[PDB]
């Protein structure tokens, strides 16, 4: 069909990236397809960061379609900040392409040690215009306007190591990715893909919470006060000065997480947020959760949640859609 498909390759079944191209000469890059941000960036040839020494860099001189800008800009993520300047060149995703304003990152030190430990060169934001720095229209919105795709929407079907690969589909909804039918939840703001849901972590509840659906986040996040209470009665231990929480794999008290809207319910069984630490000793398990204080009631449903539910991001409907993923 006309839908533009982009494969999502799995790495140590903890993260996934996809391929993207910049420039008329088509320089390739491994990118994080991040619904939690709205800017695109690839490490620049002019980047002196040690991290850049092992990454695919972008050479703007090798592209005749390159439009110089120069404006300086920084992008701050929960995991760190990157710096560089704007440029504009041809951007290629799957079989679609288009001139798009992006950032050439020349400084990645504050994204370490993550940046060099994992494998991705840059990040492609899939959020909304107001979530971007530089008022940039989402590329999927761009493509739809330029009639290169049927609908201004995209979907995420995450991979499962040694089972199947995942796919970022742009343009339409492919029924082979999920079971049953898709239910939608209207966004409370066209910034992140954020909706209202009553959060239920066992007996702990936060009604009408603000929930962000983010493919670029590898855990489930909750406000500190709420998550610390949660871990309190569940015998969850925090490794000192480290974003890691563990408990016993045989802990039968870890509840099924519940996210309810007026009409729908989304759950996440413990199997989706617990992992044995050692590959030979299954005594202790890691809890895929992390305290993040954006505000008093904001939660981030990252990959653990998306490995269970196929997701649809519809700009026109200004909604996020959910359904059980196949396999």
């Amino acid at each position: 069909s006309e839908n533009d498909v982009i494969e999502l390759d799995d790495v140590a079944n903890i993260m996934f990236y996809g391929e993207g191209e910049v420039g008329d000469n088509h320089q390739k890059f491994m990118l994080i397809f991040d619904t939690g941000s709205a800017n695109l960036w690839v490490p620049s040839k002019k980047c002196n960061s040690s991290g850049c020494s092992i990454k695919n860099l972008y050479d703007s001189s090798k592209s005749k379609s390159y439009e110089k800008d120069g404006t300086k800009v920084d992008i701050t993520y929960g995991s760190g900040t990157v710096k560089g300047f704007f440029s504009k060149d041809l951007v290629t995703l799957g079989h679609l392409s288009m001139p798009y304003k992006f950032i050439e990152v020349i400084d990645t030190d504050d994204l370490e040690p993550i940046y060099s430990s994992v494998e991705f060169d840059g990040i492609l934001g899939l959020g909304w215009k107001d979530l971007s720095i530089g008022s940039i229209d989402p590329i999927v919105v761009e493509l739809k306007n330029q009639n290169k795709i049927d609908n201004a929407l995209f979907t995420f079907y995450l991979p499962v190591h040694d089972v199947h690969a995942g796919y970022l589909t742009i343009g339409g909804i492919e029924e082979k990715f999920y079971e049953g039918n898709i239910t939608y939840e209207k966004l409370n703001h066209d910034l992140y893909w954020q909706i209202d849901l009553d959060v239920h972590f066992g007996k702990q509840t936060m009604e009408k919470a603000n929930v962000i659906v983010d493919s670029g986040t590898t855990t489930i996040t909750a406000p500190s006060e709420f998550l610390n209470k949660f871990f309190a009665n569940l015998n969850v231990i925090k490794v000192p000065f480290l974003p890691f929480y563990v408990t016993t794999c045989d802990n039968k008290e870890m509840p099924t997480l519940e996210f309810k809207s007026a009409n729908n319910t989304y759950t996440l069984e413990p199997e989706y947020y617990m992992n044995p630490i050692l590959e030979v000793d299954d005594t202790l398990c890691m809890i895929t959760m992390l305290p993040v204080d954006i505000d008093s009631n904001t939660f981030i449903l990252g990959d653990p949640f998306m490995r269970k539910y196929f997701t649809v991001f519809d700009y026109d409907k200004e909604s996020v859609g959910f359904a059980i993923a196949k396999n």
Partner: peptide, 6 residues
């Protein structure tokens, strides 16, 4: 872990 924009 990773948390992608403020």
């Amino acid at each position: 872990x990773v948390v992608x924009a403020x």
